[PDB]
Amino acid sequence: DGNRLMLNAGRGNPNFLATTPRRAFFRLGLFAAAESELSYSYMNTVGVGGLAKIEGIEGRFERYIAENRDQEGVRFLGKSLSYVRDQLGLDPAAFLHEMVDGILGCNYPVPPRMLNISEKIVRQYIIREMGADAIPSESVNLFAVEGGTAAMAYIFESMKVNGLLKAGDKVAIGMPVFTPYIEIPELAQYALEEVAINADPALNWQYPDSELDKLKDPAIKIFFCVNPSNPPSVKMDERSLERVRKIVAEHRPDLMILTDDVYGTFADGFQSLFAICPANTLLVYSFSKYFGATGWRLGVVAAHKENIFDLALGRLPESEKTALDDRYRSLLPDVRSLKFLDRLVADSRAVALNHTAGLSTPQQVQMTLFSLFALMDESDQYKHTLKQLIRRREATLYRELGTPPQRDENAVDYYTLIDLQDVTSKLYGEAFSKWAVKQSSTGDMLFRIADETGIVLLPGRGFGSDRPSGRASLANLNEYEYAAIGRALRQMADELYAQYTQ
Amino acid sequence: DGNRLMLNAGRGNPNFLATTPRRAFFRLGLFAAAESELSYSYMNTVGVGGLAKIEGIEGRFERYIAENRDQEGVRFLGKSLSYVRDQLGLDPAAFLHEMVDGILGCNYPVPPRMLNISEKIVRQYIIREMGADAIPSESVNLFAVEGGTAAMAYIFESMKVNGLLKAGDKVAIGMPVFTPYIEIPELAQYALEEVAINADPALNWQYPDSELDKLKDPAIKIFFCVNPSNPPSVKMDERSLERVRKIVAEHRPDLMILTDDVYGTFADGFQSLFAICPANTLLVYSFSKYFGATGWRLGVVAAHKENIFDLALGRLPESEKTALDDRYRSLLPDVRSLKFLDRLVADSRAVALNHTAGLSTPQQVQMTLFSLFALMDESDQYKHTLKQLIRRREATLYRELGTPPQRDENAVDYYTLIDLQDVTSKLYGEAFSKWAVKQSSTGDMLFRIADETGIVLLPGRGFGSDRPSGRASLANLNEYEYAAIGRALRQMADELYAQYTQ
Ligand SMILES: *Cc1c(COP(=O)(O)O)cnc(C)c1O
Ligand SMILES: *Cc1c(COP(=O)(O)O)cnc(C)c1O
Ligand SMILES: [Cl-]
Ligand SMILES: [Cl-]
């Protein structure tokens, strides 16, 4: 399943996971279960509870924390309350009841877009990790969704439905990008045309100015990028972000930006395009990778309250405004005041079902607890732990290839590129590396590792020339498995060197 | 004492008792004791507490419930709060403080008639078990008293004092009734005249229309009945209740009804005369039999807020109104607005002591807890348990007499009639049963059982012919004792059959 996921979906699945916010969730659940039972009125039954009451919830919660000081999840829950009440200044009783009611999953999400306090908490996390601090928190709204996967499906459908993207429109795509994102515009369902914004291996996988300038073409309605990138696993540098900023400000104030920033926390000092061009950007952030929460399906779509999506909607042709008046008629009297972010919500479940739309309340609670976990960790201990783990696995991989590729300030390294030439160069000089590349390819490299270790790697391209290389995730295997990849690739190189000399 | 009670008082005393509401009471007491100690200010003393404080009582109570989840009485107390707050919509803090203050018995009952929340709770129980659901709860008021025993004493005295019953007035009494109720009107203290409303054995102890029509006599001021009956142990059927209803509506809107419905819960789908004619009826309900609480002395008098007792009081001759103005002068400025139900309270302790009158607060608390116990038991598990117990004891009794009398929909069976003829008929045919009755009587039947088993039974009459029969309570003995009664009565029948044949 780990090997099959990389081939099919270009992921990625970590073998680590955040335990403390998970324990806090299950412990909160036991508290909420007791809260439900406090509202059950009848004798001689079993298995039926009532709704949790907001009245006196703080005092009951405080007792629960005091009696269970020995439980890690409970201590976390205790500090979470302080963080929300004391640092965020939010209503403590309202926070607790939203969490209790939320984890019970006994009420339809209200509002459907996101639960009130969860939105306020999660956006603090999002703003911080995206480097978007210069934007007032109150100007950022979130739509809680079933991972980045759901976000992308919802966004393209709403773009189509609301006439923001039309058949024949050009979508610029920062490349190399993983397979799934190439196909969605290529669907006849959308019939969009791709323009490649190509990263340069000579610039260490940054986008050249010349490539970024392609965005000046007014036929290009949207810039779509994974940042930090996947496969290449680098973050857009200061120059690149500035270039986009100037292009938007100077030439294309109408350019929509769709940015997928799931790997952000794995970079040093990450800054999102959302931070740089908030009015022009829809941010997709997934909790999957950082918290080891792929199965939880936790994501948000973020939008600035003043954005070009709502501006474009006000500039639509009359026939389209009339069609949308009909579409959203049941939702509100004035459809023209219905914002794009809330249209995403309505479009996600056929409009008529808007009031039972949204991410499940226990999922939002869990998302909120992951968010708190990271926010309360001021010295970034969890982040550093994961980074040290990733570096250890890297050292182990390149042990006999030695050693790892040199990493700059823009490095992410969730993924690593094992380049045959660079490896054979490090081992046996420049002359040998030129020859070794002409002998074997990516196929012979990936098939050998697979046969020796049972691990299949991603080809390392490209698009390029088929420079013989493979990509491994530093997130999904254990040390001896990275050591076995290195050993198999070292024997392959050693046998090439014995076929070099003689 | 069990045998002596049936002979003297026509009871009845169960050998079962409701344990859960009793455990809840004692557990509540320990909580209240701690509440009292929280208000004690001084050092180096022992055995002195203060008054329980309403402030923060919910939170303290909730902690008490959480720490003692393993205690049956405490779990019941926890669910009681939910029932009162959530299902009845009453003030939870006020409920708790009434219960805490109540069980401490540290304040005179206020108001004297009944404690406020206890009245609201207990009437829900009363209305449900009496089948009086069609009457709005707010239109039913209760006077908490020391069992049905105190109720009857109080009611007759107030009837006399307030001129509603006068010497020479006729009291109709549904018969057979147990001894105590025959004597109270016969007292020179009241000098009332009895009219027998006779139940018909041919109608399975229902009152014939012809007997019920006796109520048309305007000299009959009150209909007094035990329903379900005692001794006969049947409930008034649909026809009988309708007959009384029409008689009251058509001929006697002035007829007072006094109904004693202690056995109600032992019938299937019981409906009280209070439900049928609320404006005309004073309901006496005792908790003694159903909860096995004879020693607790727990009863209520129930009255509709719009009733013929207050109507009659407004129609009294001027000399009587003047006398009552003097009597109740200290109570309120306008004595003519003092309702009959509150007159019962004032008459119970000599008027001048009205403000220290009423049932003890711990008794009312216990009554409230019995009421909750039954209200919260939606599937009527306790009721069914008692009924199955009663049926088992019946099967055991008639095992060798076999088998029990056929029971119709109006059957109660707390008591059972052991008819010699019917028993000997079931065993040895109709011819033998006619002869066996002419040989032995009720005396020879009751004296034989007494000598063989040590149990004395009630004669089974009548008034009738002395058809040789005995009444046993199915509530007061254990299985082997019922088996010994059956065996003694079977040998008596077998020796009669050996004196038949030869
Ligand atoms: C793993 C990954 C995601 C996260 O997907 P979810 O559906 O949120 O689990 C998003 N984008 C890219 C490019 C990824 O590699
Ligand atoms: C047992 C019984 C009662 C109950 O008497 P308390 O004084 O309430 O215990 C009332 N009426 C009748 C006919 C009974 O047999
Ligand atoms: Cl835990
Ligand atoms: Cl107990």
mmCIF file of all heavy atoms in Angstrom, chain B residues 261-287:
data_model
loop_
_atom_site.group_PDB
_atom_site.id
_atom_site.type_symbol
_atom_site.label_atom_id
_atom_site.label_comp_id
_atom_site.label_asym_id
_atom_site.label_seq_id
_atom_site.Cartn_x
_atom_site.Cartn_y
_atom_site.Cartn_z
ATOM 1 N N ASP B 261 -57.323 5.355 46.134
ATOM 2 C CA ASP B 261 -56.800 4.632 44.980
ATOM 3 C C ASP B 261 -55.398 4.065 45.186
ATOM 4 O O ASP B 261 -54.586 4.039 44.261
ATOM 5 C CB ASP B 261 -56.871 5.512 43.729
ATOM 6 C CG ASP B 261 -58.298 5.904 43.359
ATOM 7 O OD1 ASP B 261 -59.192 5.867 44.228
ATOM 8 O OD2 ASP B 261 -58.532 6.254 42.183
ATOM 9 N N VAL B 262 -55.146 3.581 46.399
ATOM 10 C CA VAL B 262 -53.859 3.004 46.796
ATOM 11 C C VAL B 262 -53.421 1.797 45.944
ATOM 12 O O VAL B 262 -52.219 1.588 45.729
ATOM 13 C CB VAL B 262 -53.839 2.656 48.334
ATOM 14 C CG1 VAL B 262 -54.878 1.596 48.695
ATOM 15 C CG2 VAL B 262 -52.456 2.227 48.790
ATOM 16 N N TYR B 263 -54.385 1.016 45.454
ATOM 17 C CA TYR B 263 -54.066 -0.190 44.680
ATOM 18 C C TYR B 263 -53.981 0.044 43.171
ATOM 19 O O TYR B 263 -53.751 -0.901 42.412
ATOM 20 C CB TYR B 263 -55.049 -1.330 44.995
ATOM 21 C CG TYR B 263 -54.987 -1.788 46.431
ATOM 22 C CD1 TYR B 263 -56.007 -1.470 47.324
ATOM 23 C CD2 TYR B 263 -53.904 -2.530 46.900
ATOM 24 C CE1 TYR B 263 -55.950 -1.876 48.656
ATOM 25 C CE2 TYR B 263 -53.833 -2.942 48.232
ATOM 26 C CZ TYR B 263 -54.861 -2.610 49.101
ATOM 27 O OH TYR B 263 -54.806 -3.010 50.418
ATOM 28 N N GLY B 264 -54.143 1.300 42.749
ATOM 29 C CA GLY B 264 -54.215 1.663 41.325
ATOM 30 C C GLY B 264 -53.146 1.056 40.435
ATOM 31 O O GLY B 264 -53.452 0.490 39.385
ATOM 32 N N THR B 265 -51.892 1.162 40.872
ATOM 33 C CA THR B 265 -50.734 0.690 40.109
ATOM 34 C C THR B 265 -50.674 -0.826 39.943
ATOM 35 O O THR B 265 -49.916 -1.323 39.116
ATOM 36 C CB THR B 265 -49.405 1.149 40.754
ATOM 37 O OG1 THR B 265 -49.391 0.750 42.125
ATOM 38 C CG2 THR B 265 -49.238 2.664 40.667
ATOM 39 N N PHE B 266 -51.453 -1.559 40.734
ATOM 40 C CA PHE B 266 -51.500 -3.022 40.628
ATOM 41 C C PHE B 266 -52.517 -3.508 39.583
ATOM 42 O O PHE B 266 -52.542 -4.688 39.238
ATOM 43 C CB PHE B 266 -51.756 -3.665 41.997
ATOM 44 C CG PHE B 266 -50.645 -3.448 42.990
ATOM 45 C CD1 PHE B 266 -50.710 -2.401 43.913
ATOM 46 C CD2 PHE B 266 -49.528 -4.275 42.997
ATOM 47 C CE1 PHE B 266 -49.686 -2.187 44.833
ATOM 48 C CE2 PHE B 266 -48.493 -4.071 43.917
ATOM 49 C CZ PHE B 266 -48.577 -3.021 44.836
ATOM 50 N N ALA B 267 -53.343 -2.592 39.082
ATOM 51 C CA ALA B 267 -54.264 -2.884 37.980
ATOM 52 C C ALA B 267 -53.598 -2.609 36.632
ATOM 53 O O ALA B 267 -52.603 -1.885 36.557
ATOM 54 C CB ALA B 267 -55.539 -2.055 38.119
ATOM 55 N N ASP B 268 -54.142 -3.199 35.571
ATOM 56 C CA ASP B 268 -53.695 -2.882 34.216
ATOM 57 C C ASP B 268 -54.481 -1.691 33.673
ATOM 58 O O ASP B 268 -55.713 -1.724 33.623
ATOM 59 C CB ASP B 268 -53.840 -4.095 33.290
ATOM 60 C CG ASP B 268 -52.964 -5.279 33.713
ATOM 61 O OD1 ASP B 268 -51.920 -5.069 34.374
ATOM 62 O OD2 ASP B 268 -53.324 -6.429 33.375
ATOM 63 N N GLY B 269 -53.763 -0.638 33.291
ATOM 64 C CA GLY B 269 -54.368 0.555 32.698
ATOM 65 C C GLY B 269 -55.401 1.228 33.581
ATOM 66 O O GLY B 269 -56.514 1.526 33.134
ATOM 67 N N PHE B 270 -55.030 1.477 34.834
ATOM 68 C CA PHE B 270 -55.951 2.049 35.806
ATOM 69 C C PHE B 270 -56.409 3.457 35.438
ATOM 70 O O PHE B 270 -55.629 4.271 34.944
ATOM 71 C CB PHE B 270 -55.354 2.036 37.218
ATOM 72 C CG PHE B 270 -56.274 2.596 38.266
ATOM 73 C CD1 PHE B 270 -57.425 1.907 38.638
ATOM 74 C CD2 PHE B 270 -55.997 3.821 38.872
ATOM 75 C CE1 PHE B 270 -58.291 2.426 39.600
ATOM 76 C CE2 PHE B 270 -56.853 4.347 39.835
ATOM 77 C CZ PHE B 270 -58.004 3.645 40.200
ATOM 78 N N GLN B 271 -57.687 3.727 35.684
ATOM 79 C CA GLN B 271 -58.221 5.071 35.554
ATOM 80 C C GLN B 271 -59.060 5.406 36.776
ATOM 81 O O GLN B 271 -60.012 4.694 37.107
ATOM 82 C CB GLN B 271 -59.038 5.224 34.271
ATOM 83 C CG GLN B 271 -59.293 6.672 33.901
ATOM 84 C CD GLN B 271 -59.887 6.843 32.510
ATOM 85 O OE1 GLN B 271 -60.690 6.025 32.052
ATOM 86 N NE2 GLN B 271 -59.502 7.924 31.837
ATOM 87 N N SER B 272 -58.685 6.496 37.436
ATOM 88 C CA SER B 272 -59.319 6.951 38.660
ATOM 89 C C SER B 272 -60.623 7.701 38.388
ATOM 90 O O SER B 272 -60.806 8.289 37.315
ATOM 91 C CB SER B 272 -58.352 7.866 39.412
ATOM 92 O OG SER B 272 -58.928 8.355 40.611
ATOM 93 N N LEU B 273 -61.520 7.693 39.373
ATOM 94 C CA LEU B 273 -62.700 8.558 39.334
ATOM 95 C C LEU B 273 -62.288 10.031 39.319
ATOM 96 O O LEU B 273 -63.024 10.886 38.827
ATOM 97 C CB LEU B 273 -63.628 8.279 40.515
ATOM 98 C CG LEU B 273 -64.530 7.048 40.400
ATOM 99 C CD1 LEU B 273 -64.968 6.576 41.783
ATOM 100 C CD2 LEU B 273 -65.738 7.345 39.522
ATOM 101 N N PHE B 274 -61.106 10.318 39.858
ATOM 102 C CA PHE B 274 -60.552 11.661 39.784
ATOM 103 C C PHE B 274 -60.352 12.109 38.330
ATOM 104 O O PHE B 274 -60.625 13.256 37.996
ATOM 105 C CB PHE B 274 -59.244 11.774 40.584
ATOM 106 C CG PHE B 274 -58.693 13.169 40.629
ATOM 107 C CD1 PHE B 274 -59.310 14.148 41.406
ATOM 108 C CD2 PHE B 274 -57.577 13.517 39.868
ATOM 109 C CE1 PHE B 274 -58.814 15.444 41.438
ATOM 110 C CE2 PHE B 274 -57.075 14.812 39.898
ATOM 111 C CZ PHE B 274 -57.695 15.777 40.681
ATOM 112 N N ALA B 275 -59.885 11.195 37.480
ATOM 113 C CA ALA B 275 -59.719 11.447 36.046
ATOM 114 C C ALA B 275 -61.055 11.706 35.344
ATOM 115 O O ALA B 275 -61.144 12.535 34.429
ATOM 116 C CB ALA B 275 -59.008 10.269 35.391
ATOM 117 N N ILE B 276 -62.085 10.985 35.785
ATOM 118 C CA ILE B 276 -63.401 11.014 35.155
ATOM 119 C C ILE B 276 -64.229 12.215 35.630
ATOM 120 O O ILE B 276 -64.840 12.907 34.813
ATOM 121 C CB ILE B 276 -64.160 9.671 35.381
ATOM 122 C CG1 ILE B 276 -63.324 8.477 34.884
ATOM 123 C CG2 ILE B 276 -65.534 9.687 34.715
ATOM 124 C CD1 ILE B 276 -63.033 8.470 33.379
ATOM 125 N N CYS B 277 -64.224 12.467 36.939
ATOM 126 C CA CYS B 277 -64.957 13.587 37.525
ATOM 127 C C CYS B 277 -64.072 14.470 38.420
ATOM 128 O O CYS B 277 -64.325 14.566 39.623
ATOM 129 C CB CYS B 277 -66.153 13.075 38.346
ATOM 130 S SG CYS B 277 -67.292 11.951 37.493
ATOM 131 N N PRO B 278 -63.053 15.142 37.839
ATOM 132 C CA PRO B 278 -62.087 15.881 38.673
ATOM 133 C C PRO B 278 -62.697 16.986 39.543
ATOM 134 O O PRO B 278 -62.274 17.159 40.689
ATOM 135 C CB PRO B 278 -61.110 16.477 37.648
ATOM 136 C CG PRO B 278 -61.839 16.459 36.356
ATOM 137 C CD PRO B 278 -62.750 15.277 36.402
ATOM 138 N N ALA B 279 -63.680 17.713 39.008
ATOM 139 C CA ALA B 279 -64.340 18.805 39.732
ATOM 140 C C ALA B 279 -65.087 18.323 40.969
ATOM 141 O O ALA B 279 -65.297 19.084 41.907
ATOM 142 C CB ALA B 279 -65.292 19.575 38.807
ATOM 143 N N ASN B 280 -65.477 17.053 40.968
ATOM 144 C CA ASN B 280 -66.295 16.501 42.044
ATOM 145 C C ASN B 280 -65.551 15.614 43.037
ATOM 146 O O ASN B 280 -66.128 15.204 44.055
ATOM 147 C CB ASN B 280 -67.482 15.743 41.458
ATOM 148 C CG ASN B 280 -68.519 16.666 40.864
ATOM 149 O OD1 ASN B 280 -69.533 16.971 41.501
ATOM 150 N ND2 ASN B 280 -68.273 17.125 39.640
ATOM 151 N N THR B 281 -64.275 15.347 42.754
ATOM 152 C CA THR B 281 -63.516 14.313 43.459
ATOM 153 C C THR B 281 -62.339 14.825 44.298
ATOM 154 O O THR B 281 -61.528 15.637 43.838
ATOM 155 C CB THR B 281 -62.979 13.258 42.460
ATOM 156 O OG1 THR B 281 -64.027 12.857 41.572
ATOM 157 C CG2 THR B 281 -62.445 12.037 43.185
ATOM 158 N N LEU B 282 -62.261 14.334 45.533
ATOM 159 C CA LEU B 282 -61.037 14.406 46.325
ATOM 160 C C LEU B 282 -60.344 13.062 46.233
ATOM 161 O O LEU B 282 -60.907 12.040 46.626
ATOM 162 C CB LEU B 282 -61.327 14.730 47.786
ATOM 163 C CG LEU B 282 -61.585 16.185 48.178
ATOM 164 C CD1 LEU B 282 -62.023 16.255 49.638
ATOM 165 C CD2 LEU B 282 -60.360 17.060 47.934
ATOM 166 N N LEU B 283 -59.128 13.063 45.697
ATOM 167 C CA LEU B 283 -58.355 11.840 45.558
ATOM 168 C C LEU B 283 -57.434 11.647 46.745
ATOM 169 O O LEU B 283 -56.671 12.544 47.109
ATOM 170 C CB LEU B 283 -57.541 11.855 44.267
ATOM 171 C CG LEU B 283 -56.521 10.740 44.015
ATOM 172 C CD1 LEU B 283 -57.177 9.364 43.879
ATOM 173 C CD2 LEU B 283 -55.717 11.071 42.777
ATOM 174 N N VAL B 284 -57.525 10.466 47.348
ATOM 175 C CA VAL B 284 -56.575 10.041 48.351
ATOM 176 C C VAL B 284 -55.679 8.985 47.709
ATOM 177 O O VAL B 284 -56.161 7.930 47.274
ATOM 178 C CB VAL B 284 -57.284 9.486 49.608
ATOM 179 C CG1 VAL B 284 -56.276 8.869 50.574
ATOM 180 C CG2 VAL B 284 -58.081 10.593 50.301
ATOM 181 N N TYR B 285 -54.384 9.292 47.623
ATOM 182 C CA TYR B 285 -53.403 8.314 47.162
ATOM 183 C C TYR B 285 -52.301 8.056 48.180
ATOM 184 O O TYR B 285 -51.624 8.977 48.638
ATOM 185 C CB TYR B 285 -52.779 8.693 45.816
ATOM 186 C CG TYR B 285 -51.788 7.641 45.355
ATOM 187 C CD1 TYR B 285 -52.225 6.487 44.702
ATOM 188 C CD2 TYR B 285 -50.423 7.775 45.620
ATOM 189 C CE1 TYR B 285 -51.327 5.509 44.296
ATOM 190 C CE2 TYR B 285 -49.522 6.807 45.229
ATOM 191 C CZ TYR B 285 -49.980 5.674 44.565
ATOM 192 O OH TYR B 285 -49.086 4.718 44.173
ATOM 193 N N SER B 286 -52.129 6.784 48.514
ATOM 194 C CA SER B 286 -51.106 6.346 49.437
ATOM 195 C C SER B 286 -49.960 5.666 48.689
ATOM 196 O O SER B 286 -50.181 4.892 47.754
ATOM 197 C CB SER B 286 -51.713 5.381 50.449
ATOM 198 O OG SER B 286 -50.705 4.734 51.203
ATOM 199 N N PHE B 287 -48.742 5.960 49.126
ATOM 200 C CA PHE B 287 -47.521 5.366 48.576
ATOM 201 C C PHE B 287 -47.179 4.039 49.269
ATOM 202 O O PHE B 287 -46.253 3.346 48.864
ATOM 203 C CB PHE B 287 -46.355 6.362 48.719
ATOM 204 C CG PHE B 287 -46.410 7.508 47.734
ATOM 205 C CD1 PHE B 287 -47.337 8.538 47.883
ATOM 206 C CD2 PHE B 287 -45.538 7.549 46.649
ATOM 207 C CE1 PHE B 287 -47.397 9.586 46.963
ATOM 208 C CE2 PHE B 287 -45.595 8.588 45.723
ATOM 209 C CZ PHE B 287 -46.528 9.609 45.881
#
